[PDB]
Write a protein that binds this ligand. Structure first.
Ligand SMILES: *P(=O)(O)OCC(C)(C)[C@@H](O)C(=O)NCCC(=O)NCCS
Length: 515
């Protein structure tokens, strides 16, 4: 759970009166001392509701280390040569949504970088090979058996990488979306595909990485670009990249997680314990919410979608951060509360279940590596009683901290335990997702050129609605709404995401007004 790390950063920043607090900055090196350590502990106890002590801060003086400590489950260890691949339960759920609900390429994740230079295709191909050699998860196939899916780790010399140039014919943003949507056959193809887009209207090139989600979450963007940059620069100079072996492969992480999780039939295992919480917490859940769609739910889901964006003025982004600090919540919690208000005002009622991904990256061996570490949680917020926005923030905090203490039970096991009525055109337990994302910083000079990330207007959709508050890595932010085209017209989606901005604006202006 990254939320613990954000709060520790937030408390460090307020106590130290510093705005340059990063997850690996040492409290005392930043100007902390015993007197201020009392304030850090008191604030953390007040915001997290757990027993925090000076001993924790002394022994774990960085936000990443302290967040891992307050949570902690065994550390991830390398299993060594010829340890067999292990498919994680999170990977299992992704393979399974796609097999069962036939999501086409909706779970492909794009990473697009405009480059001022056209890159060398043969050098790029060599660098992708190095990248795949480094990260086993990028060359692990998934094959169907009659027990479930089996991983198949390809040796680096047997991994056939797919790197190609594509001439742009029309608007590049549409082409990026179409390339992103092409489905993978994970039984025969590695889950990474690379395209360099060139054309008359393109100055330089657009480098597009398409991963299947089974191999990467959005926190993988930073190591992916970092390692690809290193391999490209080395191969352009005629040599193999000079890197240090990974502290762990994804299979090392998966093996540790599964051994800690235990079995569902063991009443003392963390899995059964967290499953029992979720069975209680999701009792009498709505099958779906009463959303203002342009069309009723079809019998068959097409997974077509669009993407509507709402730009946020810098002033509003700071007001949202200020509101979060002032009420002792994360930016995600504010956005979550705002989405709940929006849906509530549109007639969805007082019981609002919102899905949200949660990253399992606290362990230092995987904190900054490539892979899919997201579990999905149902955050059930209640809006009965005419609460103010400040009231709702307290409610959302409590709901989220309870859920975060129980974030290892795989979502597919939660759905199985809760046993909702199933329908191929409705995602179970929730149909609106909310997340916070933050794009990599210092990715403006990759490959020896001038570079910048470009967002991709997805042609697909996973749910009815997916809201994302996305920070761009250099101060800016926008809200992205990935909506199901079966339910919403694009102009309705533009209105919805503008309304979410209005809720946020009203909330910062006066949090004491009633929802
Ligand atoms: P933190 O580790 O920054 O704490 C500093 C301290 C309070 C431990 C230290 O500055 C301090 O005052 N230690 C006590 C010194 C002492 O007991 N001498 C008194 C002679 S009776």
């Amino acid at each position: 759970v990254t939320a613990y790390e954000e709060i520790v950063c937030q408390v460090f920043a307020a106590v130290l009166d510093r705005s340059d607090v990063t997850a690996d900055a040492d409290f005392f090196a930043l100007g902390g001392h015993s007197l201020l350590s009392l304030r850090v502990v008191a604030r953390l106890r007040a915001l997290l509701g757990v027993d925090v002590g000076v001993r924790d801060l002394f022994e774990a003086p960085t936000p990443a280390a302290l967040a891992a400590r307050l949570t902690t489950r065994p550390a991830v260890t390398r299993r060594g040569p010829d340890a067999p691949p292990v498919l994680s339960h999170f990977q299992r759920g992704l393979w399974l949504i796609e097999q069962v609900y036939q999501t086409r390429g909706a779970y492909n994740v794009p990473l697009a970088v405009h480059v001022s230079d056209r890159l060398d295709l043969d050098v790029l191909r060599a660098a992708v090979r190095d990248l795949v050699a480094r990260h086993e998860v990028l060359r692990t196939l998934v094959r169907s058996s009659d027990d479930g899916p089996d991983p198949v780790l390809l040796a680096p010399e047997d991994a056939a990488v797919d790197v190609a140039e594509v001439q742009a014919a029309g608007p590049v943003a549409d082409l990026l979306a179409e390339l992103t949507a092409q489905p993978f056959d994970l039984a025969t193809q590695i889950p990474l595909r690379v395209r360099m887009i060139t054309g008359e209207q393109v100055d330089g090139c657009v480098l597009l990485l398409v991963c299947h989600h089974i191999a990467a979450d959005e926190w993988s963007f930073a190591p992916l670009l970092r390692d690809l940059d290193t391999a490209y620069r080395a191969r352009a100079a005629g040599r193999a990249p000079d890197w240090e072996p990974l502290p762990a492969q994804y299979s090392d992480y998966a093996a540790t997680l599964h051994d800690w999780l235990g079995e569902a039939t063991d009443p003392a295992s963390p899995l059964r314990r967290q499953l029992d919480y979720w069975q209680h917490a999701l009792q009498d859940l709505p099958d779906e919410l009463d959303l203002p769609t342009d069309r009723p739910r079809p019998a068959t889901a097409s997974h077509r979608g669009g993407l509507a964006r709402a730009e946020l003025p810098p002033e509003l982004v700071e007001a949202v951060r200020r509101l979060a600090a002032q009420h002792g919540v994360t930016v995600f919690m504010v956005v979550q509360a705002a989405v709940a208000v929006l849906l509530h005002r549109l007639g969805a009622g007082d019981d609002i279940p919102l899905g949200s991904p949660v990253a399992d990256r606290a362990d230092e061996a995987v904190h900054d590596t490539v892979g899919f570490f997201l579990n999905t949680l149902v955050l059930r917020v209640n809006l009965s009683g005419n609460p103010t926005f400040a009231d709702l923030l307290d409610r959302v905090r409590a709901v989220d901290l309870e859920a975060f203490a129980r974030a290892d039970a795989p979502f597919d096991a939660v759905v199985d335990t809760v046993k909702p009525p199933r329908a191929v055109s409705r995602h179970p337990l929730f149909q609106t997702m909310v997340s916070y994302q933050r794009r990599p910083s210092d990715v403006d000079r990759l490959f020896g050129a001038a570079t910048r990330l470009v967002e991709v207007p997805l042609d697909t959709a996973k749910f009815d609605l997916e809201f994302a508050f996305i920070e761009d890595g250099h101060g800016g932010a926008h809200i992205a709404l990935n909506y199901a085209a079966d339910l919403f017209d694009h102009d309705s989606a533009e209105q919805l995401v503008a309304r979410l901005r209005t809720v946020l604006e009203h909330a910062c202006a006066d949090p004491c007004r009633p929802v």
